[PDB]
Amino acid sequence: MFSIQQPLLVFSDLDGTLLDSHSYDWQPAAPWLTRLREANVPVILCSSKTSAEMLYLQKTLGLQGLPLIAENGAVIQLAEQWQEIDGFPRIISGISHGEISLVLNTLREKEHFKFTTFDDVDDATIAEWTGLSRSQAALTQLHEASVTLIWRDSDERMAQFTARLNELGLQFMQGARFWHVLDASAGKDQAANWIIATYQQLSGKRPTTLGLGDGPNDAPLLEVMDYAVIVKGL
Amino acid sequence: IQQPLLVFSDLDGTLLDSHSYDWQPAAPWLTRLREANVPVILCSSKTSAEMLYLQKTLGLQGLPLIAENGAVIQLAEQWQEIDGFPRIISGISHGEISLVLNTLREKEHFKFTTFDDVDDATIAEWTGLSRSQAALTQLHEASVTLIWRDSDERMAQFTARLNELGLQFMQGARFWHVLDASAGKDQAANWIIATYQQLSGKRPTTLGLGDGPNDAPLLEVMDYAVIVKGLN
């Protein structure tokens, strides 16, 4: 008899632990993550990276067709098998990359905040900044619902900048190396919540969830998990 | 330096006064846009001499422009620090193209007449321009304008020969143009956009204005693109 298994979901926010940095289309984790997928232990990649970058990374890890959380929760990729879910294939914040760029330029032109976004440079410069190839650097440039930037001003100028972003319905998010601007009402936890709720309605059964982070700022995502671990490579 | 807001205009025949002189209706408008720092970058199949003339009558002298289907790029006045200033031309010049074209005509007997093969009065007659403007239409830096006088089958073997030699055969409204195969209005536009971006430290926002479906390549690299048609 056909049966929908209780969902056992892994939320993975492991920048620079799980991936091989210099390595290519050939990820050491792929054989492993492939067998987990086949046993129905879905690994849901969650990241500040763009949808396009995430989707390519998902494919090289053997996880294509699974949900994922991109752009800090501003973009949610739906499972391949979720055709009937409102929002399929992808849920993007109503505040696009384009409108955020408009906002950031207005603030820069008028108030003279000092910063450089990923949009202000070519992909050879992003390749240099990130250590990616030109090609991966290109996908790192295709934001849908956020902007990545380097902040080049003082802490007090940053404070007046967050405040100004906040009153416009935007948040200013600190990642490992860069800052991110996106819809204030979006977030890795919010995205995760929605994904969990979807598995729960489809299956009829409460998902059990596991979050993997590699730092203290993974807290929001990890807070909503049943089980949460910080992992440290050797 | 402020965020660049750039207009790429490929609108010869909508912008320009059909009959008129050094006196262009668009000049006072475009002069004000230039003062507001909204540069209008003219883009054309027309020659560099022609386009520099038109640019000056339009109030736009000192701004970049795209001539000869991208085989010539005039740099901004203020770009003295940019490798290639004042003008970047394809390494395949008009002289070299003329050599290739004459070799094909003499050895393979393709039937065609270039703008180099006739006098100014005959160009004025073909183009409706005055003799003096026709003279500028005749100066090419990195391309050849021609009228094809052979059959379509002969034309197909001509494009192929040109392609093998690093050259493209590009149809315009009236005439054909021969130029470096690696050049384009789009390629030249990208380079200008990238230069504004390097000098400003900010992503330029770009608008393309064209007046037909033949303007696809240029309009394609723009953030915003419109077709404009004169009313009637």
Short mmCIF file of C-alpha atoms in Angstrom, two decimals:
data_model
loop_
_atom_site.label_atom_id
_atom_site.label_comp_id
_atom_site.label_asym_id
_atom_site.label_seq_id
_atom_site.Cartn_x
_atom_site.Cartn_y
_atom_site.Cartn_z
CA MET A 1 0.00 0.00 0.00
CA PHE A 2 1.16 3.48 -0.97
CA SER A 3 1.97 5.59 2.14
CA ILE A 4 3.31 9.11 2.75
CA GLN A 5 6.19 8.80 5.16
CA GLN A 6 6.59 11.03 8.16
CA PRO A 7 8.82 13.87 6.96
CA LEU A 8 12.34 13.95 8.40
CA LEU A 9 13.83 17.20 7.24
CA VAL A 10 17.34 18.51 7.39
CA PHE A 11 17.86 22.29 7.12
CA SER A 12 21.47 22.89 6.04
CA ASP A 13 23.05 26.32 6.44
CA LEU A 14 26.67 25.25 6.06
CA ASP A 15 28.59 27.82 4.01
CA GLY A 16 32.25 26.80 3.78
CA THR A 17 31.92 23.53 5.70
CA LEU A 18 29.96 21.23 3.34
CA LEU A 19 31.26 22.61 0.03
CA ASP A 20 34.67 22.23 -1.52
CA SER A 21 35.73 25.86 -2.21
CA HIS A 22 38.28 25.55 -5.02
CA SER A 23 36.47 22.42 -6.31
CA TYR A 24 34.11 22.48 -9.19
CA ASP A 25 30.99 20.75 -10.36
CA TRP A 26 32.45 17.92 -8.29
CA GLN A 27 31.34 18.08 -4.70
CA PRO A 28 32.62 15.53 -2.16
CA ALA A 29 29.18 15.53 -0.45
CA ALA A 30 27.23 14.59 -3.58
CA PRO A 31 27.40 10.73 -3.36
CA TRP A 32 26.34 11.00 0.29
CA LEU A 33 23.53 13.51 -0.18
CA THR A 34 22.29 11.45 -3.17
CA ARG A 35 21.70 8.31 -1.01
CA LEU A 36 19.95 10.42 1.69
CA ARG A 37 17.60 11.80 -0.92
CA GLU A 38 16.81 8.26 -2.15
CA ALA A 39 16.04 7.17 1.43
CA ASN A 40 13.67 10.21 1.82
CA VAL A 41 15.76 12.30 4.22
CA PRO A 42 15.47 15.62 2.29
CA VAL A 43 18.34 18.07 2.85
CA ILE A 44 17.03 21.61 2.38
CA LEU A 45 19.85 24.03 1.55
CA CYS A 46 19.41 27.40 3.20
CA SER A 47 21.60 30.38 2.35
CA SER A 48 22.12 34.08 1.71
CA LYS A 49 23.19 33.17 -1.86
CA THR A 50 21.08 33.86 -4.92
CA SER A 51 18.48 31.47 -6.25
CA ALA A 52 20.56 30.82 -9.41
CA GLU A 53 23.77 30.04 -7.50
CA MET A 54 21.83 27.86 -5.01
CA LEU A 55 20.15 25.91 -7.83
CA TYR A 56 23.48 25.13 -9.49
CA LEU A 57 24.99 24.13 -6.11
CA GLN A 58 21.89 22.01 -5.38
CA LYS A 59 22.39 20.18 -8.69
CA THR A 60 26.09 19.44 -7.97
CA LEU A 61 25.23 18.10 -4.48
CA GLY A 62 22.63 15.76 -5.97
CA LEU A 63 19.66 17.55 -4.37
CA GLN A 64 17.85 19.00 -7.41
CA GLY A 65 14.07 18.90 -7.09
CA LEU A 66 14.12 19.54 -3.35
CA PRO A 67 13.05 22.79 -1.73
CA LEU A 68 15.65 25.36 -0.85
CA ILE A 69 15.86 28.73 0.85
CA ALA A 70 17.85 31.39 -1.02
CA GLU A 71 18.54 35.09 -0.49
CA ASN A 72 18.03 34.84 3.27
CA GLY A 73 14.45 33.61 2.87
CA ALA A 74 13.49 36.17 0.20
CA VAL A 75 13.35 33.34 -2.34
CA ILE A 76 11.87 29.90 -1.66
CA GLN A 77 12.33 27.12 -4.22
CA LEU A 78 9.46 24.60 -4.01
CA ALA A 79 9.89 20.84 -4.27
CA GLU A 80 9.58 19.57 -7.88
CA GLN A 81 6.55 17.49 -6.79
CA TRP A 82 4.70 20.54 -5.37
CA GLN A 83 2.94 21.66 -8.64
CA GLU A 84 -0.37 22.13 -6.75
CA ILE A 85 1.07 24.42 -4.06
CA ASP A 86 0.21 28.10 -4.51
CA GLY A 87 3.46 29.86 -5.39
CA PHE A 88 5.06 26.96 -7.34
CA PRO A 89 7.84 26.75 -8.57
CA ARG A 90 9.22 29.64 -6.51
CA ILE A 91 8.15 32.16 -3.87
CA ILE A 92 9.89 35.51 -4.21
CA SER A 93 9.28 38.48 -1.94
CA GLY A 94 7.07 41.19 -3.44
CA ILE A 95 10.06 43.57 -2.95
CA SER A 96 12.30 42.65 -5.89
CA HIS A 97 16.02 43.18 -6.47
CA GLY A 98 15.04 46.07 -8.86
CA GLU A 99 13.08 48.07 -6.27
CA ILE A 100 15.81 47.54 -3.62
CA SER A 101 18.41 48.80 -6.12
CA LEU A 102 16.22 51.90 -6.64
CA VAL A 103 16.07 52.48 -2.87
CA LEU A 104 19.83 51.96 -2.40
CA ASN A 105 20.75 54.31 -5.22
CA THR A 106 18.43 57.01 -3.89
CA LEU A 107 20.05 56.72 -0.45
CA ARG A 108 23.54 56.74 -1.98
CA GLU A 109 22.88 59.66 -4.38
CA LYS A 110 21.12 61.82 -1.75
CA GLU A 111 22.83 60.93 1.55
CA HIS A 112 26.24 59.88 0.28
CA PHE A 113 26.44 56.58 2.18
CA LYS A 114 29.61 54.80 1.11
CA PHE A 115 29.08 51.31 -0.20
CA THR A 116 29.50 49.22 -3.31
CA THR A 117 26.91 46.59 -4.28
CA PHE A 118 27.48 43.41 -6.32
CA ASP A 119 25.60 45.21 -9.13
CA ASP A 120 28.15 48.11 -9.30
CA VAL A 121 31.02 45.85 -10.61
CA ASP A 122 31.80 43.23 -13.31
CA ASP A 123 31.96 39.51 -12.51
CA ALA A 124 35.78 39.40 -12.69
CA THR A 125 35.71 41.75 -9.64
CA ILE A 126 33.19 39.55 -7.86
CA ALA A 127 35.42 36.55 -8.77
CA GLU A 128 38.28 38.36 -7.01
CA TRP A 129 36.15 39.38 -4.01
CA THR A 130 34.63 35.94 -3.48
CA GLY A 131 37.35 33.62 -4.80
CA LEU A 132 34.78 32.15 -7.21
CA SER A 133 35.29 31.63 -10.95
CA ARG A 134 33.87 34.19 -13.39
CA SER A 135 31.03 31.73 -14.12
CA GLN A 136 29.96 31.17 -10.49
CA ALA A 137 30.56 34.88 -9.85
CA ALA A 138 27.99 35.55 -12.63
CA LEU A 139 25.28 33.47 -10.85
CA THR A 140 26.25 35.26 -7.64
CA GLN A 141 25.11 38.45 -9.42
CA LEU A 142 21.61 37.28 -10.36
CA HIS A 143 19.58 38.40 -7.34
CA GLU A 144 15.82 38.25 -7.43
CA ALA A 145 14.78 39.78 -4.16
CA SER A 146 17.82 41.18 -2.39
CA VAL A 147 21.07 43.10 -2.87
CA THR A 148 24.57 42.05 -1.69
CA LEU A 149 27.01 44.81 -0.78
CA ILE A 150 30.29 45.86 0.77
CA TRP A 151 29.86 48.52 3.42
CA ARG A 152 32.65 51.12 3.21
CA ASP A 153 31.38 53.72 5.69
CA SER A 154 31.51 54.19 9.50
CA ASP A 155 29.37 52.44 12.20
CA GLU A 156 27.29 55.59 12.84
CA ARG A 157 26.64 55.99 9.10
CA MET A 158 25.68 52.30 9.10
CA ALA A 159 23.23 52.96 11.98
CA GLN A 160 21.49 55.78 10.11
CA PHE A 161 21.49 53.48 7.04
CA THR A 162 19.75 50.45 8.92
CA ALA A 163 17.20 52.89 10.41
CA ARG A 164 16.44 54.38 7.02
CA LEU A 165 16.23 50.89 5.45
CA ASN A 166 13.90 49.74 8.31
CA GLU A 167 11.45 52.63 7.89
CA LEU A 168 11.24 51.58 4.21
CA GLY A 169 10.37 47.93 5.04
CA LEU A 170 13.90 46.61 4.44
CA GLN A 171 16.37 44.85 6.74
CA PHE A 172 20.18 44.93 6.60
CA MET A 173 21.62 41.47 7.18
CA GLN A 174 25.25 40.68 8.08
CA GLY A 175 26.60 37.50 6.49
CA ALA A 176 30.04 35.87 6.74
CA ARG A 177 31.74 38.35 4.39
CA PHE A 178 29.04 40.63 2.91
CA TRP A 179 25.89 42.55 3.82
CA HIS A 180 22.45 41.84 2.38
CA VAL A 181 19.44 44.05 1.87
CA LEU A 182 16.03 42.45 1.58
CA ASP A 183 12.38 42.55 2.59
CA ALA A 184 12.18 43.01 6.39
CA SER A 185 9.37 40.48 6.75
CA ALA A 186 11.41 37.74 5.06
CA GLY A 187 13.90 35.46 6.85
CA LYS A 188 15.49 32.00 6.93
CA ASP A 189 13.23 31.08 9.89
CA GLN A 190 10.09 32.35 8.10
CA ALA A 191 10.99 30.42 4.93
CA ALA A 192 11.76 27.29 6.98
CA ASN A 193 8.44 27.63 8.81
CA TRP A 194 6.56 27.71 5.51
CA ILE A 195 8.46 24.71 4.11
CA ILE A 196 7.82 22.73 7.33
CA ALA A 197 4.08 23.64 7.23
CA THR A 198 3.89 22.49 3.61
CA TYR A 199 5.42 19.07 4.34
CA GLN A 200 3.01 18.79 7.28
CA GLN A 201 -0.15 19.50 5.24
CA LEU A 202 0.95 17.24 2.37
CA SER A 203 1.87 14.25 4.57
CA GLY A 204 -0.69 14.60 7.39
CA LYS A 205 2.19 14.12 9.82
CA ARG A 206 4.29 16.51 11.92
CA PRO A 207 7.76 16.84 10.37
CA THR A 208 10.76 16.29 12.64
CA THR A 209 13.44 18.82 11.76
CA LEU A 210 17.18 19.09 12.13
CA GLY A 211 19.18 22.25 11.57
CA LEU A 212 22.91 22.40 10.86
CA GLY A 213 24.76 25.69 11.19
CA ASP A 214 28.42 26.55 11.53
CA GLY A 215 28.17 29.73 13.67
CA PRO A 216 26.25 31.77 16.31
CA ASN A 217 24.39 33.81 13.64
CA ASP A 218 22.63 30.69 12.35
CA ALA A 219 20.46 31.15 15.45
CA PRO A 220 17.18 32.30 13.77
CA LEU A 221 16.92 29.29 11.42
CA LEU A 222 18.18 26.96 14.12
CA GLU A 223 15.71 28.29 16.72
CA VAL A 224 12.74 26.91 14.81
CA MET A 225 14.29 23.43 14.52
CA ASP A 226 13.34 20.46 16.74
CA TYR A 227 17.04 19.55 16.87
CA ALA A 228 19.91 21.93 16.13
CA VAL A 229 23.69 21.41 15.94
CA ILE A 230 26.65 23.60 15.22
CA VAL A 231 29.19 21.76 13.12
CA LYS A 232 32.88 22.48 12.92
CA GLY A 233 35.09 20.86 10.28
CA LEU A 234 38.55 19.52 11.18
CA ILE B 1 30.47 61.25 -9.56
CA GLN B 2 26.72 60.50 -9.76
CA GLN B 3 25.11 57.28 -10.86
CA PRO B 4 25.23 57.22 -14.65
CA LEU B 5 21.84 57.43 -16.37
CA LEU B 6 22.57 56.72 -20.03
CA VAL B 7 20.49 56.95 -23.16
CA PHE B 8 21.52 55.02 -26.28
CA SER B 9 19.74 56.49 -29.26
CA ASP B 10 19.58 54.71 -32.61
CA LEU B 11 17.00 57.06 -34.12
CA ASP B 12 18.38 58.57 -37.31
CA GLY B 13 15.19 59.31 -39.23
CA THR B 14 13.05 60.08 -36.21
CA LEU B 15 15.34 62.58 -34.33
CA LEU B 16 16.83 64.37 -37.35
CA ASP B 17 15.12 67.06 -39.44
CA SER B 18 14.38 65.38 -42.82
CA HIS B 19 15.52 68.36 -44.89
CA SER B 20 17.31 70.72 -42.49
CA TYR B 21 20.81 71.88 -41.91
CA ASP B 22 23.07 72.75 -39.02
CA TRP B 23 19.74 73.62 -37.40
CA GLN B 24 18.27 70.61 -35.64
CA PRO B 25 14.95 70.85 -33.78
CA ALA B 26 16.28 68.40 -31.13
CA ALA B 27 19.35 70.50 -30.20
CA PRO B 28 17.90 72.80 -27.45
CA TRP B 29 16.28 69.76 -25.75
CA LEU B 30 19.37 67.54 -25.90
CA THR B 31 21.59 70.42 -24.74
CA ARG B 32 19.45 70.66 -21.56
CA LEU B 33 19.65 66.85 -21.01
CA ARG B 34 23.40 67.05 -21.29
CA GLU B 35 23.43 69.84 -18.61
CA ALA B 36 21.26 67.65 -16.36
CA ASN B 37 23.83 64.83 -16.74
CA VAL B 38 21.61 62.54 -18.84
CA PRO B 39 24.03 61.76 -21.69
CA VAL B 40 22.52 60.79 -25.00
CA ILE B 41 24.90 58.36 -26.74
CA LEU B 42 24.17 58.37 -30.47
CA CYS B 43 24.41 55.00 -32.16
CA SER B 44 24.51 54.51 -35.93
CA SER B 45 25.64 52.61 -38.99
CA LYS B 46 26.74 56.04 -40.29
CA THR B 47 30.35 56.97 -40.55
CA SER B 48 32.39 58.62 -37.82
CA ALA B 49 32.77 61.89 -39.75
CA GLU B 50 29.00 62.06 -40.37
CA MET B 51 28.11 61.20 -36.74
CA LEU B 52 30.61 63.68 -35.28
CA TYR B 53 28.98 66.35 -37.42
CA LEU B 54 25.46 65.35 -36.38
CA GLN B 55 26.48 65.10 -32.71
CA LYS B 56 27.80 68.67 -32.81
CA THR B 57 24.61 70.06 -34.43
CA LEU B 58 22.51 68.21 -31.80
CA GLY B 59 24.38 69.79 -28.85
CA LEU B 60 26.11 66.56 -27.92
CA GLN B 61 29.80 67.18 -28.80
CA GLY B 62 32.18 65.72 -26.24
CA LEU B 63 29.90 62.72 -25.48
CA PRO B 64 30.60 59.15 -26.51
CA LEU B 65 29.01 57.86 -29.72
CA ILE B 66 28.85 54.59 -31.68
CA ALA B 67 29.67 54.88 -35.39
CA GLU B 68 29.93 52.38 -38.27
CA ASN B 69 27.82 49.72 -36.59
CA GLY B 70 30.23 49.65 -33.62
CA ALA B 71 33.48 49.58 -35.65
CA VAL B 72 34.15 53.05 -34.27
CA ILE B 73 33.70 54.29 -30.72
CA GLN B 74 34.16 57.97 -29.93
CA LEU B 75 35.16 58.37 -26.30
CA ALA B 76 33.90 61.03 -23.92
CA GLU B 77 35.81 64.34 -23.79
CA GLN B 78 36.69 63.54 -20.15
CA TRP B 79 38.06 60.02 -20.81
CA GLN B 80 41.72 61.00 -21.53
CA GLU B 81 42.86 58.36 -18.97
CA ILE B 82 41.08 55.54 -20.82
CA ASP B 83 43.28 53.35 -23.02
CA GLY B 84 42.22 54.14 -26.60
CA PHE B 85 41.31 57.82 -26.16
CA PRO B 86 40.07 59.72 -28.19
CA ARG B 87 38.67 56.99 -30.47
CA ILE B 88 38.63 53.20 -30.57
CA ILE B 89 38.48 51.75 -34.09
CA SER B 90 38.45 48.09 -35.16
CA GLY B 91 41.94 46.87 -36.07
CA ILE B 92 40.41 46.07 -39.48
CA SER B 93 40.39 49.49 -41.17
CA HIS B 94 38.46 50.79 -44.15
CA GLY B 95 41.64 50.44 -46.29
CA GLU B 96 42.03 46.74 -45.50
CA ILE B 97 38.32 46.04 -46.11
CA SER B 98 38.59 47.88 -49.46
CA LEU B 99 41.53 45.59 -50.35
CA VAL B 100 39.50 42.47 -49.51
CA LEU B 101 36.47 43.77 -51.35
CA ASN B 102 38.46 44.52 -54.49
CA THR B 103 40.20 41.15 -54.40
CA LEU B 104 36.76 39.41 -54.38
CA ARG B 105 35.42 41.61 -57.16
CA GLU B 106 38.49 41.19 -59.42
CA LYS B 107 39.04 37.46 -58.81
CA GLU B 108 35.46 36.18 -58.31
CA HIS B 109 33.63 38.91 -60.24
CA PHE B 110 30.97 39.71 -57.64
CA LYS B 111 28.79 42.59 -58.84
CA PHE B 112 28.59 45.56 -56.47
CA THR B 113 29.44 49.23 -56.12
CA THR B 114 30.90 50.68 -52.93
CA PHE B 115 30.58 54.34 -51.83
CA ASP B 116 34.34 54.56 -52.62
CA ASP B 117 33.71 53.72 -56.33
CA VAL B 118 31.67 56.89 -57.11
CA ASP B 119 31.86 60.66 -56.63
CA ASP B 120 30.15 62.80 -53.96
CA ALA B 121 27.40 63.93 -56.43
CA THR B 122 26.41 60.29 -57.01
CA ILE B 123 26.23 59.65 -53.27
CA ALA B 124 24.14 62.81 -52.76
CA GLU B 125 21.87 61.35 -55.45
CA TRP B 126 21.67 57.91 -53.76
CA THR B 127 21.23 59.26 -50.22
CA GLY B 128 19.26 62.46 -50.86
CA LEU B 129 21.90 64.29 -48.78
CA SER B 130 23.64 67.49 -49.91
CA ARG B 131 26.96 67.06 -51.72
CA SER B 132 28.81 68.25 -48.59
CA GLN B 133 27.12 65.74 -46.28
CA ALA B 134 27.52 62.96 -48.86
CA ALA B 135 31.29 63.67 -48.61
CA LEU B 136 31.14 62.84 -44.85
CA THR B 137 29.06 59.79 -45.75
CA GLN B 138 31.97 58.74 -47.97
CA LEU B 139 34.71 59.00 -45.27
CA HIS B 140 34.88 55.61 -43.48
CA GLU B 141 37.32 54.63 -40.76
CA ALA B 142 36.54 50.94 -40.30
CA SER B 143 33.83 49.83 -42.71
CA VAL B 144 32.61 49.92 -46.33
CA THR B 145 29.13 50.88 -47.50
CA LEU B 146 27.98 49.29 -50.77
CA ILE B 147 25.08 48.62 -53.13
CA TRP B 148 24.78 44.95 -54.11
CA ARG B 149 24.29 44.42 -57.90
CA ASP B 150 24.35 40.67 -58.14
CA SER B 151 21.96 37.78 -57.51
CA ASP B 152 20.87 36.42 -54.12
CA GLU B 153 22.79 33.17 -54.69
CA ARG B 154 25.92 35.25 -55.38
CA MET B 155 25.18 37.26 -52.23
CA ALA B 156 25.15 34.06 -50.13
CA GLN B 157 28.61 33.00 -51.39
CA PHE B 158 29.76 36.61 -50.69
CA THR B 159 28.64 36.58 -46.96
CA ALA B 160 30.47 33.25 -46.50
CA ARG B 161 33.73 34.45 -48.08
CA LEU B 162 33.55 37.61 -45.93
CA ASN B 163 32.85 35.49 -42.80
CA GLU B 164 35.88 33.29 -43.50
CA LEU B 165 37.95 36.52 -43.71
CA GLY B 166 36.80 37.89 -40.33
CA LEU B 167 34.15 40.20 -41.84
CA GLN B 168 30.39 40.57 -41.56
CA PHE B 169 27.88 41.71 -44.15
CA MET B 170 25.27 43.82 -42.43
CA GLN B 171 22.04 44.99 -44.05
CA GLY B 172 20.75 48.47 -43.34
CA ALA B 173 17.62 50.32 -44.49
CA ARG B 174 19.05 51.02 -47.96
CA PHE B 175 22.66 49.84 -48.11
CA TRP B 176 24.90 46.94 -47.02
CA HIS B 177 27.88 47.44 -44.73
CA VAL B 178 31.07 45.45 -44.41
CA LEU B 179 33.02 45.56 -41.10
CA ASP B 180 34.92 43.47 -38.53
CA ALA B 181 32.78 40.45 -37.63
CA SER B 182 33.57 40.90 -33.93
CA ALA B 183 32.14 44.46 -33.82
CA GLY B 184 28.55 45.44 -33.06
CA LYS B 185 26.35 48.27 -31.73
CA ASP B 186 25.73 45.97 -28.75
CA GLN B 187 29.48 45.20 -28.25
CA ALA B 188 30.36 48.90 -28.43
CA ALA B 189 27.42 49.76 -26.08
CA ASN B 190 28.64 47.21 -23.53
CA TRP B 191 32.10 48.76 -23.60
CA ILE B 192 30.75 52.34 -23.06
CA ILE B 193 28.43 51.12 -20.26
CA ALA B 194 31.39 49.29 -18.61
CA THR B 195 33.55 52.44 -18.87
CA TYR B 196 30.95 54.69 -17.20
CA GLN B 197 30.63 52.03 -14.49
CA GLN B 198 34.42 51.79 -13.89
CA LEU B 199 34.81 55.59 -13.69
CA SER B 200 31.74 56.10 -11.43
CA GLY B 201 32.02 53.03 -9.16
CA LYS B 202 28.22 52.71 -9.75
CA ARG B 203 26.11 50.56 -12.08
CA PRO B 204 24.77 52.73 -14.88
CA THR B 205 21.06 52.41 -15.72
CA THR B 206 20.51 52.35 -19.46
CA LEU B 207 17.72 53.23 -21.88
CA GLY B 208 17.70 52.29 -25.59
CA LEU B 209 15.69 54.14 -28.22
CA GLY B 210 15.24 52.48 -31.61
CA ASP B 211 12.74 52.85 -34.41
CA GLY B 212 12.43 49.31 -35.80
CA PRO B 213 12.90 45.53 -35.32
CA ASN B 214 16.40 45.75 -36.86
CA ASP B 215 17.60 47.44 -33.63
CA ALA B 216 17.24 44.22 -31.62
CA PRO B 217 20.92 43.70 -30.74
CA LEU B 218 21.51 47.19 -29.33
CA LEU B 219 18.16 47.38 -27.49
CA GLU B 220 18.78 43.93 -25.99
CA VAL B 221 21.66 44.91 -23.77
CA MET B 222 19.69 47.87 -22.33
CA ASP B 223 17.90 47.81 -18.94
CA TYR B 224 15.03 49.66 -20.66
CA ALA B 225 14.26 49.73 -24.38
CA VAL B 226 11.50 51.37 -26.42
CA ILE B 227 10.50 51.65 -30.05
CA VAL B 228 9.51 55.19 -30.96
CA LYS B 229 7.39 56.05 -33.97
CA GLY B 230 6.68 59.57 -35.31
CA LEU B 231 2.90 60.12 -35.10
CA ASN B 232 0.40 60.26 -38.01
#
